[PDB]
């Protein structure tokens, strides 16, 4: 059976915590007053909620209200407890209140307002310096949550809200996030296709914080190369093929062999044999102003098949890539 794995950082942070901290099933929600909030416009509907701009009539401040869909009941206190544990952390969206919605008969999460410009629009615009700046800001959020014993598990451009006027960033949508417990097996049906780590794509359940660094790597490749998404598979199987076209099949085998994992035999007629490519292969006239030797080396160090070999958030913030960014 599979060889076990553990995180190389913050391995035991929840084992030394009081039970209250990670046992979200036992959490008692503190409900505020639903009358304080007035919905103004619908912003989006996801798998698991509907999201509104709203106004808080006790301070007239703009807020965001997320009304949960009545499904997968356990996710609900998990998300609340994670948001309460991380509140006040660098670049972590601030849960301001929780109220009972009388129409949906579910919890509605009330957050601080962020005035995001659209990722597709905003990616078209980032300068070299701005990619580095914003990458550092996200790393702050990820190191904070990882050091608090939590993995986000859905890092992607849609979940990283940016107010480009005020140069301010928030990591949102903690509904897939989980507590890291050494040796725990996790569901591999997390993150969105283009951002799933190789561990997910080969059905390896004993993963950790390092999943988020694979996703961050995919976001970085998409920005510096100006190709959205960078690994563009048709489904979860083709997703691994597209990765193996860049990383190579020999290092994929080395990975699965290390953890004594077998690929789904459905890979037998689709995977082929591929060499590992040099990252320069993806550079052209239209993206070259976004690329540098430091950018390519930092990317190379995030996008590893072996989750254990990837830079930690802390180590990524140390990287030469960020030397040009003002502290
Ligand atoms: O602020 C959030 C926001 C803040 C916290 C969340 O957990 C969240 O899912 C969202 C969110 O989904 C969202 C959106 O879809 C569109 C515009 C937004 O401002 C947001």
UniProtKB/Swiss-Prot annotation:
ATP binds at residues 43-51, 66. Its main location: nucleus. The chain holds residues 3 to 329 of 391 of the full protein. It is linked to Okur-Chung neurodevelopmental syndrome: An autosomal dominant neurodevelopmental disorder characterized by developmental delay, intellectual disability, behavioral problems, hypotonia, speech problems, microcephaly, pachygyria and variable dysmorphic features. Catalytic subunit of a constitutively active serine/threonine-protein kinase complex that phosphorylates a large number of substrates containing acidic residues C-terminal to the phosphorylated serine or threonine. Regulates numerous cellular processes, such as cell cycle progression, apoptosis and transcription, as well as viral infection. May act as a regulatory node which integrates and coordinates numerous signals leading to an appropriate cellular response. This is Casein kinase II subunit alpha. One of its GO terms (molecular function) is protein serine kinase activity. Residues 34-39 are annotated as: Interaction with beta subunit. Phosphorylation does not directly affect casein kinase 2 activity, but may contribute to its regulation by forming binding sites for interacting proteins and/or targeting it to different compartments. Heterotetramer composed of two catalytic subunits (alpha chain and/or alpha' chain) and two regulatory subunits (beta chains). The tetramer can exist as a combination of 2 alpha/2 beta, 2 alpha'/2 beta or 1 alpha/1 alpha'/2 beta subunits. Also part of a CK2-SPT16-SSRP1 complex composed of SSRP1, SUPT16H, CSNK2A1, CSNK2A2 and CSNK2B, which forms following UV irradiation. Interacts with RNPS1. Interacts with SNAI1. Interacts with PML (isoform PML-12). Interacts with CCAR2. Interacts with HIRIP3. Can use both ATP and GTP as phosphoryl donors. Phosphorylation by casein kinase 2 has been estimated to represent up to one quarter of the eukaryotic phosphoproteome. Casein kinase 2 has been found to be increased at protein level and up-regulated at the level of enzyme activity in the majority of cancers. However, elevated levels of casein kinase 2 are present in certain normal organs such as brain and testes. GO terms for biological process: apoptotic process; chaperone-mediated protein folding; DNA damage response; double-strand break repair; negative regulation of apoptotic signaling pathway; negative regulation of double-strand break repair via homologous recombination; negative regulation of proteasomal ubiquitin-dependent protein catabolic process; negative regulation of signal transduction by p53 class mediator. One of its GO terms (cellular component) is cytosol. Constitutively active protein kinase whose activity is not directly affected by phosphorylation. Seems to be regulated by level of expression and localization. Keywords: Apoptosis, ATP-binding, Biological rhythms, Cell cycle, Disease variant, Intellectual disability, Kinase, Nucleotide-binding, Nucleus, Phosphoprotein, Serine/threonine-protein kinase, Transcription, Transcription regulation, Transferase, Wnt signaling pathway. It is found in: Nucleus. Its EC number is 2.7.11.1. The active site is at 154 (proton acceptor). Residues 37-322 form the Protein kinase domain. Belongs to the protein kinase superfamily. Ser/Thr protein kinase family. CK2 subfamily. It comes from Homo sapiens (Human).
């Amino acid at each position: 059976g599979p060889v076990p794995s553990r995180a190389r950082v913050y391995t035991d942070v929840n084992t030394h915590r009081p039970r209250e901290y990670w046992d979200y099933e036992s959490h008692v929600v503190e409900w505020g007053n639903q009358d304080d909030y007035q919905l103004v416009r619908k912003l989006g509907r996801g798998k698991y909620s509907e999201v509104f701009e709203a106004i808080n009539i006790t301070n007239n401040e703009k807020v965001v209200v997320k009304i949960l869909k009545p499904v997968k009941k356990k996710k609900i206190k998990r998300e609340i407890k994670i948001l309460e544990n991380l509140r006040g952390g660098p670049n972590i969206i601030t849960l301001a209140d929780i109220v009972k919605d009388p129409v949906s008969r579910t919890p509605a999460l009330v957050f601080e307002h962020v005035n995001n410009t659209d990722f597709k629009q905003l990616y078209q615009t980032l300068t070299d310096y701005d990619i580095r700046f914003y990458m550092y800001e996200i790393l702050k959020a990820l190191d904070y949550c990882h050091s608090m014993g939590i993995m986000h598990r859905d890092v992607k451009p849609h979940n990283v809200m940016i107010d480009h006027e005020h140069r301010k960033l928030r990591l949102i949508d903690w509904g897939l996030a989980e507590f890291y417990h050494p040796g725990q097996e996790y569901n591999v049906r997390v993150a969105s296709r283009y951002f799933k780590g190789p561990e997910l794509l080969v059905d390896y359940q004993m993963y950790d914080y390092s999943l988020d660094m694979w996703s961050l790597g995919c976001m970085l490749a998409s920005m510096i190369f100006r190709k959205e998404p960078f690994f563009h598979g048709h489904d979860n199987y083709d997703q691994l093929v597209r990765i193996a076209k860049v990383l190579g099949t020999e290092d994929l085998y080395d990975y699965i062999d290390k953890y004594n994992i077998e690929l789904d035999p459905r890979f037998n007629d689709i995977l082929g044999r591929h060499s590992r490519k040099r990252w320069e292969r993806f550079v052209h006239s239209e993206n070259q102003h976004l690329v540098s030797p430091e950018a390519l080396d930092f990317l190379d160090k995030l996008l590893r098949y072996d989750h254990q070999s990837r830079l930690t958030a802390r180590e990524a913030m140390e990287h030469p890539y960020f030397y040009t960014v003002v502290k």
